[PDB]
Design a protein around this ligand. Structure first.
Ligand SMILES: CC(=O)Nc1ccc(O)cc1
Length: 115
């Protein structure tokens, strides 16, 4: 199963768009966490591989995902980073959980169609 870059992008983009359409829940995830601006030097000590929606979109737009599971991995990386670093009742954690709910709903039929 070799994937054409534009077809992989076309099949996956709606799942990413669904995340972006979540307002306010996507908002903390539409751009990278910047620990220097936020003044949180511990962030990169906990989150070794940062990920966010803007980076996932750029990768999806620029043929950086050869296979669908690589995209799925990055989305889960984004979620797991947020759930690891932040308090359970924090806004970011709660918002993350909503995006995860949406993603789990969107991704299943898409991954089945691709496979
Ligand atoms: C997605 C995320 O982890 N955002 C975030 C983390 C720490 C902070 O102090 C402010 C925002």
């Amino acid at each position: 199963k070799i994937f054409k870059p534009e077809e992989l992008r076309q099949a996956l983009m709606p799942t990413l768009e669904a995340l972006y359409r979540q307002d306010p829940e996507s908002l903390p995830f539409r751009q990278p966490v910047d620990p220097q601006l936020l003044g949180i030097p511990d962030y990169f000590d906990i989150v070794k591989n940062p990920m966010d929606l803007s980076t996932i979109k750029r990768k999806l737009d620029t043929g950086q995902y050869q296979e669908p599971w690589q995209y799925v991995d990055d989305v889960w990386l984004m979620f797991n980073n947020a759930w690891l670093y932040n308090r359970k009742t924090s806004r970011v954690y709660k918002f993350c959980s909503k995006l995860a709910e949406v993603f789990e709903q969107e991704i299943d039929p898409v991954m089945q169609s691709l496979g």
